[PDB]
Design a protein around this ligand. Structure first.
Ligand SMILES: [Co+2]
Ligand SMILES: [Co+2]
Ligand SMILES: [Fe+2]
Ligand SMILES: [Fe+2]
Lengths: 314, 314
């Protein structure tokens, strides 16, 4: 009775256990799928998601937090099917994922109207179901904090203040967007500790990463396997350094793995080059063993994968 | 055997009869409706579309061309239901309606891949049905001809050359986007006579409008009732002037009426000042009577509403 789960009763934060804080069962462009369904194969998508989740659970993963929201093809019914097939604790969210402008629907609509949509999903349920959103997801990338991106950020603050659900962000590690997201949210009264600033693992700029952590938010070292952003070994060195410097209190680790994704970039021919080892279990195969080889004890691993997600949702 | 119709056998273009070349039974943002279905009322959308179409048919309209495509919430099954309830000849299209960037799906995808989507809808059918697209719709607006906007334009040209279907455009009457669309399309081998450059009625800049007609394309005096773009009176003066100057064989007239539309701008509160007399029959109430009482004979009216559409689809 605190964090809502897809297809299950809500749980107290103490029960979320070992968590992958940022993974995607399936990503797609809503308009493209609606207009050209011939491009997609739901049987295969389902098989891929179930296979990945099952493998994560074999390594001891108990909860997966999936920040697929509007703009990334959130489908609560698909998520339900995956839960039924696996027994995973799955946390779904609400929010809006844009880089530049909002859909035309939002022309001449207020920040409050936007926040009302998030609050609907949190208090009433997602897409006509009784599965409730447990967090709000927002984004900014290369384009920076555009007017509409800012509106969404402020709407998320409103939803958090009314419901107390935490906020997960997508940012671009190289252009200050994460720092700006944290600034706007905290200025609007969001507890910095209820924010995860995403994709900071995409850079080895430790000063930037620490600056965000020092302002009180979790830092998302959350794209392990996506070498095109930063290779696994560079990520490992950055993660280790932050741990040695005492930042385990703010570190969160994940893969941002998409079991299926429709971006032209994610075509299989590009995988060997851009993300050869990208999967939902890479951190068990490489990262965690690497950290242990370098003196990181199990208490720090537990802090990152258990205590931190617990605090985030408490 | 020439123009495909939703829910009917195809017709020869000679049988198209009195036509409204640009109207929308329903417009919505795919992503918003997918994520927040509570915002929408299907019963109300259906009743409104049926009511409008019936009233148009009472005024003698035989065929409505509906350029709702990806980005505007095209729904071929909704369209089928409206046809069943009214008996209207309805021409559905394919294409992509964007102002800035394409959906993330299109990252690292070619112009050919986009064209293939349009060719699919034209040759195979729309959204898993055998209802086929009879034209391609593209857009550009305030942001101008962005990189992605241009990709879509070039994809439409490929689709036209392969299938011979005409092209309808959305443009902004004040920033040369219409002229640019025409230029790129014609450079890529599209017959200027198979292009309708849209929303030119939004300006009283007669020289700009004529330039597009002179280069061989139909001109869309197609937003009658939308005073926020240009009041009915100013539209009528422009239309009349063009006819007197000998442009009736390039003129097409419509309302761009949306029987339902989800833009925040379309809230009923704004209707009195933004579009007080806007409907799918405004031209029968105001425009055609205005033209006829100003020296425009029955042959010219037939050219605009019967001959030009026939030629466009021939
Ligand atoms: Co992200
Ligand atoms: Co338009
Ligand atoms: Fe993600
Ligand atoms: Fe339109």
């Amino acid at each position: 009775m605190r964090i809502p789960l897809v297809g299950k009763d809500s749980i107290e934060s103490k029960d979320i256990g070992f968590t992958l804080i940022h993974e995607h069962l399936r990503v797609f462009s809503e308009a493209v799928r609606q207009q050209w369904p011939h491009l997609y194969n739901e049987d295969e998508e389902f098989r891929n998601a179930v296979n990945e989740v099952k493998r994560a659970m074999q390594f001891g993963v108990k909860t997966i937090v999936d920040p697929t929201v509007m703009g990334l093809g959130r489908d609560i019914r698909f998520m339900e099917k995956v839960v039924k097939a696996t027994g995973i604790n799955l946390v779904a969210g609400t929010g809006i994922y844009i880089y530049i402008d909002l859909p035309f629907y939002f022309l001449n609509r207020s920040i409050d109207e936007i926040a009302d949509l998030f609050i609907h999903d949190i208090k009433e349920g997602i897409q006509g179901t009784l599965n409730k959103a447990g967090f709000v997801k927002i984004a900014a990338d290369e384009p920076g904090i555009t007017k509409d991106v800012e509106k969404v950020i402020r709407a998320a603050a409103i939803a958090n203040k009314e419901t107390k659900v935490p906020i997960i962000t997508h940012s671009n590690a190289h252009n200050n967007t994460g720092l700006e997201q944290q600034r706007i949210l905290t200025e609007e009264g969001v507890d910095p500790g209820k924010i995860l600033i995403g994709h900071l693992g995409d850079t080895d700029n430790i000063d930037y990463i620490k600056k965000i952590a020092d302002k009180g938010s979790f830092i998302g070292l959350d794209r392990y396997g996506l070498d095109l952003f930063l290779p696994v070994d560079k990520r490992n060195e950055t993660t280790l350094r932050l741990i040695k410097d005492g930042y385990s209190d703010k570190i969160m680790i994940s893969h941002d793995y998409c079991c299926t994704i429709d971006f032209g970039t994610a075509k299989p021919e590009y995988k060997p080059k851009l993300a050869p080892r990208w999967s939902i279990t890479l951190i068990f195969e490489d990262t965690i063993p690497f950290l242990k080889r370098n003196g990181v004890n199990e208490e720090v691993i537990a802090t990152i994968f258990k205590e931190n997600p617990k605090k985030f949702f408490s």
